[PDB]
Symmetry: C6
């Protein structure tokens, strides 16, 4: 998919839970996966139209502060990822989340 | 499920054991899973009605201090989590815990 | 099982080895499992009658000091753990340790 | 393959995502894999002609700064890696990325 | 087995390689396993008669200093481990090392 | 095998890639495996004649500095490792690397 990708990483799982919920409730985006990065850091990945990923990312960043003890470590938006990156890195749509992609 | 979700994370396993036991003894909630987060941190996840998750979370927060050397690192309650989140993050009810629902 | 649970976590494996041996030799308790917690920390879990878990735990705490370089990080006793906790967390009796439960 | 190898490692996943996308869009190179290195560090590996790996690597280094909170930790280019290194370390071309090698 | 157990943990793998080789060359002991403990710490476990484990452990401790950059973090000798500890923790003899046990 | 063993560990993967390539290009040695040690440290292991492992290790130590941001954390050479060590620790020749022997 050439949809934009957003990635956000928190210290602690509760922060990433808060961010993920805000993202998919505010932008027409699909949460496609998460990573245990080590050192109690967790990464989440969303896909969607670039403008919707921007809106979702802002909501996710602000939601991290609603989780006691959570910290926002790092985030990025890649507006139009190369197929090789989507293939190798864990950022692709998958069959588990297809029905949410259809909904966007 | 549209049930509320609570998640709490401690430094050390004993603290998460203390917290989890307090949660399910005080709220009508289901402990659905836990995560080894790395750095000796452990995450637990509960589901239930919003009122019961809040009650359980309060009891769990206070219970962490009963474990010598434990620290409460972070926690959150999401009253009405989006179905997409439940699908990807390890927060769903599962068949292992069905009898506790 | 409604038996009490004790859990103890050390910095380094040698400390948890010392503690486990002291625990099962002091109380009528079963060591049911251990966890690699990360950051070179190791968790052990015992089950048994609450009074036996208390005496075993006392011995385990003191035994950690017998390992050079070990640190006792954290421990707890839960006298009557809820079945949902026993199910999800790695604290249940299991078939690998059945013969030790029988002997207690 | 005697193609050069480039490897770059960031603090946080978003930085490695930014770097990978820049690399494969700038040089005629293939992203062959990534590593979760621990401590929330992530490694990516590209292969291609040495001149293409150099230009891709330059773009990847600069792209890390486009991810909030990311840090560039370490990187290297090996112009003509030994077959024993390609065998043991996770740097070989693989069937998952064949179509991207063909296009280079 | 009621043979003694020795456990030694280093920062870095080279230190544990040095210690393991010194142990089995100096005491009539068997190296039965190792653990990746996290945080670049490595644990090794030897078994044998208590006096031989003592001799091996001293040689292993001194060998750690022969590895550049290695640090000895923690160690213990448990002279006669309870069968429950041997069962749950990774300290038992195994079929991979039987021929070295026979040799001791 | 009674061949010598060398092991070297870096902070970051690029440093270990640099070191490994220098080793097999300078000594008649076989790189038999590597370890993700945690904390972004990576271990590599070579086997060969004592003289070749020493030569390869020297080249590998110097090569770590050619990787931006890499650090050499620790290394050792065991000229004649005990067979018990080869059995338990991941330092043996293996079928994946047979052609390099």
């Amino acid at each position: 998919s050439l949809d934009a990708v957003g990635s956000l990483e928190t210290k602690g799982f509760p922060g990433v839970l808060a961010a993920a919920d805000a993202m998919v409730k505010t932008g027409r985006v699909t949460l496609v996966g998460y990573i245990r990065a080590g050192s109690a850091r967790f990464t989440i990945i969303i896909r969607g139209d670039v403008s919707e990923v921007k809106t979702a990312m802002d909501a996710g960043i602000h939601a991290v502060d609603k989780a006691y003890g959570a910290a926002l470590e790092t985030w990025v938006i890649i507006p139009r990822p190369h197929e090789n990156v989507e293939c190798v890195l864990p950022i692709a749509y998958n069959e588990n989340v297809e029905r949410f992609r259809e909904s966007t």
